[PDB]
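Job type: complex structure
Entries:
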Amino acid sequence: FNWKLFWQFLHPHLLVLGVAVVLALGAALVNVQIPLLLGQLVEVVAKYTRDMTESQNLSTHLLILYGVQGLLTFGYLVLLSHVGERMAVDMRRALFSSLLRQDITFFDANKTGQLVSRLTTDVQEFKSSFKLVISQGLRSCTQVAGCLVSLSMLTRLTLLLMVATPALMGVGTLMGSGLRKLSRQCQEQIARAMGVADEALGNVRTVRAFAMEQREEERYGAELEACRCRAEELGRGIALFQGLSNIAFNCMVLGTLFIGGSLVAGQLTGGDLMSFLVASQTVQRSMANLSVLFGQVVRGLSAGARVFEYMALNPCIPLSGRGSVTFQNVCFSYPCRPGFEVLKDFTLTLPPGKIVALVGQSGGGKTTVASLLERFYDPTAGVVMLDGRDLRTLDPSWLRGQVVGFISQEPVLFGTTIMENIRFGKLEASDEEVYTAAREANAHEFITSFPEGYNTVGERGTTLSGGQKQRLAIARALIKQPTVLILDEATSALDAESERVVQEALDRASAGRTVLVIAHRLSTVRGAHCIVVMADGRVWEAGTHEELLKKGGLYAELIRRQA
Amino acid sequence: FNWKLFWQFLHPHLLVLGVAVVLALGAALVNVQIPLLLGQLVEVVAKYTRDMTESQNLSTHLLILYGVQGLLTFGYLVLLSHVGERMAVDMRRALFSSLLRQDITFFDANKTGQLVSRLTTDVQEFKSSFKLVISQGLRSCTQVAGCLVSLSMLTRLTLLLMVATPALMGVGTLMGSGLRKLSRQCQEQIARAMGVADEALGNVRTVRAFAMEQREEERYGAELEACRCRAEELGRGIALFQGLSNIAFNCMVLGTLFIGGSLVAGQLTGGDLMSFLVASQTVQRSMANLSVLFGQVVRGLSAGARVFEYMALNPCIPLSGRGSVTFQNVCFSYPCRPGFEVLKDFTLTLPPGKIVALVGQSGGGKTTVASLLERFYDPTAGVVMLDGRDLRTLDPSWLRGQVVGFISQEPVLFGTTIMENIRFGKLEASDEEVYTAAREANAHEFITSFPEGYNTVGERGTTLSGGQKQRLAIARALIKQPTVLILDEATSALDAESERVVQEALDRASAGRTVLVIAHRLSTVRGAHCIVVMADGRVWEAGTHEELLKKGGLYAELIRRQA
Ligand SMILES: Nc1ncnc2c1ncn2[C@@H]1O[C@H](COP(=O)(O)OP(=O)(O)NP(=O)(O)O)[C@@H](O)[C@H]1O
Ligand SMILES: Nc1ncnc2c1ncn2[C@@H]1O[C@H](COP(=O)(O)OP(=O)(O)NP(=O)(O)O)[C@@H](O)[C@H]1O
Ligand SMILES: CC(C)CCC[C@@H](C)[C@H]1CC[C@H]2[C@@H]3CC=C4C[C@@H](O)CC[C@]4(C)[C@H]3CC[C@]12C
Ligand SMILES: CC(C)CCC[C@@H](C)[C@H]1CC[C@H]2[C@@H]3CC=C4C[C@@H](O)CC[C@]4(C)[C@H]3CC[C@]12C
Ligand SMILES: CC(C)CCC[C@@H](C)[C@H]1CC[C@H]2[C@@H]3CC=C4C[C@@H](O)CC[C@]4(C)[C@H]3CC[C@]12C
Ligand SMILES: CC(C)CCC[C@@H](C)[C@H]1CC[C@H]2[C@@H]3CC=C4C[C@@H](O)CC[C@]4(C)[C@H]3CC[C@]12C
Ligand SMILES: [Mg+2]
Ligand SMILES: [Mg+2]
C-alpha cells in the first residue's frame, strides 16, 4: 500500500537507480575533493606572495577534476529526471485507470476539482520532491562523510570543530525561529483583538439604519489601544530575545575560534589551517540542505501516502459483471444524509412500446426516480423487472450499452471531432452509419454550413448553438438503437422553432421503442399516451389524460396554475 | 495621497525616526568594525601557532565593541517597533473612521471579507515590511559603504574584488533562476497537456451512461505520452543549462581567485589577506539582503498605495447634512446592472396613523421598494413627501434617528451587553427607561431566567433563541418612539406560540404611529387596514380587504394558491 505498492511499481527501474547512485557517489566524492585543493592553492599563493612555479600544476589538476565533476553531475541528474518522469507518467496512468472504475457515490461524495488537482499537481509535486530528495540527501550525506573523514585523516581538532558546527548552525537559525515566533504571535494577537470592525461591517444595513457611528468609534479605539499595549510588550519581548540570541551567538563564535585553536596548538602543517577554513562553508551548506530536505521529505511522504490511499480501492458494484420494464415496491434514499428520504413505496410499469411521461412541480425527486434503472444506485428495497429477468443478474455493461439510451437537459461535448464523437457508443462504427444517423437526427443539414465539418473539434474549438448541441446528443443516443429511451427536459431554455424541430425529431426517432420523458411544461405532454402525476415521494396519480381531466385531482390544480 | 498623506501622517515622529537612524548608523559601523578585528585575531593566532601574548587585548577590544553593538541594536529595533506600531494603530483608526462614512453603493459593490482583510492584515503586513526595510536597507547600505571604504584604505585590489563580487552573486543566483524556470516550464507543460481527464471527470454521469471507458484510456495514454516526450526534452534542456551554469560559475571562481592575487602581488601586509578574506561573507550577505528587500519594498509599496487609495474617499451623499408620508411617480433601479429595472412609476401614500401592508410572491422588488425612504439610495425620479417637507432638504441623520424605526427578518447582536445594547438609539439612555422599554417589548420576563441578566454579552457569549432575538429588536426600536415604523417579515421561521406572542407585542407597540409591514403569509395580513397587491414593478392593486375579495384580481389567485 503505502510502501509495498510503491516498491512493486518501482521495481523495474532498479538497475538505472543503482547507476544513478554510483554517479551521485562519484559527484559527491569530487565535490569533496575540490575545496581542499582550492585551500591548498590559495595558501601556496599567499605564501609565495609573502616571500607561481607550483601553482600551474595544481590549477590544471583542479580543472581536470572539475570537468569530471560537471560530466558526473550532468549524467546523474539526467538519469534522475528520466526515472522520475517515467514513474510520474506510470503513476498518473495507473491512478486514472483505477479511479475510473468507481461508482457514483465516490464522485458525488467528493468534488471533481480536488480529485483533478490530486491526480495531476499533487503527484507532479510528489515526483519532484522525491527525485530532489534522492539527489540532495545522498549528495549531502556523502559530502559530510567524505569531508569529515578527510579532515580527520589530515586530527581530533577537526572532529571537535565538526561537533561544534551544528550548535553554531542552530544558533544562526535561532534568528529565523525568532522571526517565525514574532510573526505567529503578532498574527494571534491581531486575530484575538480584532473582530469588532468585522462584526460592524458584516451587518452594515442595521448599523446605518439605527443612526449611530460614535459608539463604534470609541469601542474600536479602545480595542486598538488594548492591541496597541499588547503590541508594545510583544515587541519589547521579541527585541530582548533577539538581542540575547545575537549576543550569545557571536560570543560563542569568538570563544570557539579562540579556544579550539589554542588547544590544538598543543605540530601541524602551516598550510593546514588555510585548507581547513574552506570546508566549513561546504558543511554549513550541507546541513542547511538537510534542514530544508527534512520538510521536503515530510511533505512528499504525506502526498505519496494520500495518493496511494486514494489510488487503489474496491468498486462498490461490479462494472464488468427486449421487452417491458417495471418496478415493484422500490424505495430508496440518497446515501448521504439518509434522513432526507425520497421513495415511499413506488410502483410503476412501462408498457412495451408506448409513450410514458412524468410531471411535478418538484415531485419529491422526480429526476432520481427517473434514474436507478441504469444501476447508478442499488435499490434499498423492492424489485425491478426487465424482459422477465432481474437487472441484478443481467450484466450492467450490456444493459448500459445495448438497452438504455439517455438524454440529459445539458449535452456534453469533448475535444474529439464530431465524426468520432457520434461514434461514441461503439468504436466499430463504419462510415455510412454515422452519416445516416446524423441525417435521421437532423444534424447533417446544418453541419454542411460548417467549413471543416466532420473534422471540427469543443470548448477550445468552434462553438455550437444550443439546438445544435441537442441535435448532436440525439445522433449518439440513436447509434445503438436502444430499446428503452430516457429524455430529461428536452424542451430546455431555447426558442420555439428549434424546440418544435427537436420535438419532431424525437417523435420520428421514438417509434417502436419504449421511451420515458420528463417535462416541466404541461404543453409538451398532452400528446403522450399516459401521464403520471407525482407528489410527496409516493405516486399520486397515473392514467390517461382525458380521464385525468375528469378526475380533477392534483393535475387539475397544476394545469390551472400553469395556465 | 500615495505620498503626501503618508508624509503628513508620519510628520509627528520625525525626531524619533532620526534618533533611530543615528542608532542604525552606529550599529552598522560597529558591525563593519567587527570582521576586520576577527580576521586580525585569527591571523595572529595562526602566526603564533606557526612559530597568545597579544591576543588577550584584541579579544577584550572585540568584546567591548560587541557589547556596544548589542546595546545599539536593542535600542534601534525597540524604537523601530514603537514607531511602526504607533503608525499602524493610527492608520487603522483613521481608515476605519473614513471608511465608515461611505454609502451602501460601496458596501454592496464590494465584499465585506476583502474589506476587513485589507483593513487589518494588509496594513499589518505593510507596517511590518516598512519597518523591516527601514532597518535592513539602511544597515546593509551603510555596511557596504563602510567595509568598502575600510578595505580601500587598508588598495585597488579590494575595489576589483568588490566589483567582481556582484557577478559571482549573480552566477550563484543563476541556480535559483534555473530552478524557477524549471518549475514554471513544468507547470505550463502540465497545464497545456492535461485537461482530458478534467473534461472526462467533469461530466461523469454522461461518460458512465453511454458505456465506454476504453476510448478515454487510449486518449489519456496518448496525451500522457506526448507530455512524457515534452518532459524528456524539457528535463534534458534544464540539465544542460544547469551544468553550464555550474561549470562557468566555478571556473570564474578559480580564475578570479588566481588572477586577482597574482596581479595584486605586483608589497602589502602578510596578515592583510587573512583580514580581507572575512569581509566577503558579510558583503555577500548584504547583497542577498538587498535582493530580498527589493521584493519586500515592491510588495509594501503596492500594499500601501492600495490602502491609501481606499482610505480617503468622498461620500456619495452627505451624512451630517410628525405626519404622513407619501410617494409620487418614484422610479428607481439598482446602480449595478441598470438593465434590471425595478420601479415602473410607483405611487403610494401612508395615512398618518393607520396600518399599511404590502404583499407579493416576488413583487418585483418589494423589499427594495419598502426601502428608499431612509435615504439608502436616492430616487431616480419622482418625489417623496414627509410631513409637508421634502426629505432631501431634511437632515438624513434626524430622519434616521428620530423618525423611522426598522425591523429586519434577521436581528443583529453585538458583543456588548443587553443593557447597553438596548441603549443603542441614544447613548443618553437613563436607567428606568431601559427596563420600561424591555417590559413593554416583552423582554424583562425571560431575561430574569438568565443568570447574569443585563450583564450578559453575542457570538462569543450566551446564545439566545430566535424569539428572544426578535424580542430584543422590538425594545431597541421602541427606545426612540419612532413616528414611522417598518417591519420586514416579523413572522419569520419559528413556532406558532412565539409568533403569536411577538405579533401581540407588535400590536400593543404599533399604536398611534404609522407602520408599514411586509408579510409573505396572507394569514397575518387580514387584520390590517389596507392591502397593496404588487406585481411586475408597477403597482397592481391597493384597497381594503373586504373590497379586495369582491374585486377578484390577482389577490384572488394569490389567496387561492396560498389556501
Ligand atoms: N447527487 C446528490 N447528492 C445529494 N443529494 C442530492 C443529490 N441529487 C439530488 N439530491 C437531493 O435530493 C432532492 C431530490 O432529488 P432530485 O431528483 O434531484 O429533485 P428534482 O425535483 O427532481 N430536480 P428538478 O428537476 O430540478 O426539479 C433534491 O432536491 C436534492 O436536494
Ligand atoms: N444589494 C443588491 N445588489 C444588487 N442587486 C440586488 C440587490 N438587492 C436586490 N437585488 C436584486 O434586485 C431584485 C429585487 O430586489 P428585492 O427587493 O431584494 O426582491 P424581493 O422579491 O423583494 N426579495 P424577497 O422578500 O426575498 O422575495 C432581487 O431579486 C435581486 O435580484
Ligand atoms: C544565509 C544564512 C541562512 C547562513 C547561516 C548563517 C546566518 C544564520 C548567520 C551568520 C551571520 C549572522 C548575521 C550577523 C550580523 C547580524 C546584524 C543584525 O543587525 C541582525 C542579525 C545579523 C544580520 C545576523 C543574522 C544571522 C546570521 C546571518
Ligand atoms: C586546527 C583546528 C582547531 C582549526 C579549527 C578552526 C575552527 C574552530 C574555527 C575557524 C573559523 C570558524 C568558522 C567561521 C564561520 C562560522 C559560520 C557559522 O555559520 C557556523 C560556524 C563557522 C563555520 C565557524 C566554525 C568554527 C571555525 C571553523
Ligand atoms: C545560501 C546561498 C544563497 C549562498 C550563495 C552561494 C550559492 C548560491 C552558491 C555558492 C556554492 C554553490 C554550490 C556548490 C556545490 C554544487 C553541487 C551541485 O551538485 C549542485 C549545486 C551546488 C550545491 C552549488 C549550488 C549554488 C552554490 C550554493
Ligand atoms: C589582495 C587581493 C587581490 C585579495 C583578493 C581575494 C579575492 C579575489 C578572492 C579571495 C577568496 C574569494 C571569495 C571566495 C568565496 C566566494 C563565495 C561566492 O558566493 C561569492 C564570491 C566569493 C566571496 C569569492 C570572491 C573573491 C575572493 C574574495
Ligand atoms: Mg430532478
Ligand atoms: Mg425583498
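Summary: Residues B 366-367 surround magnesium ion (ligand 8) (CB under 6 Å). Chain A has 19 helices and ten strands.
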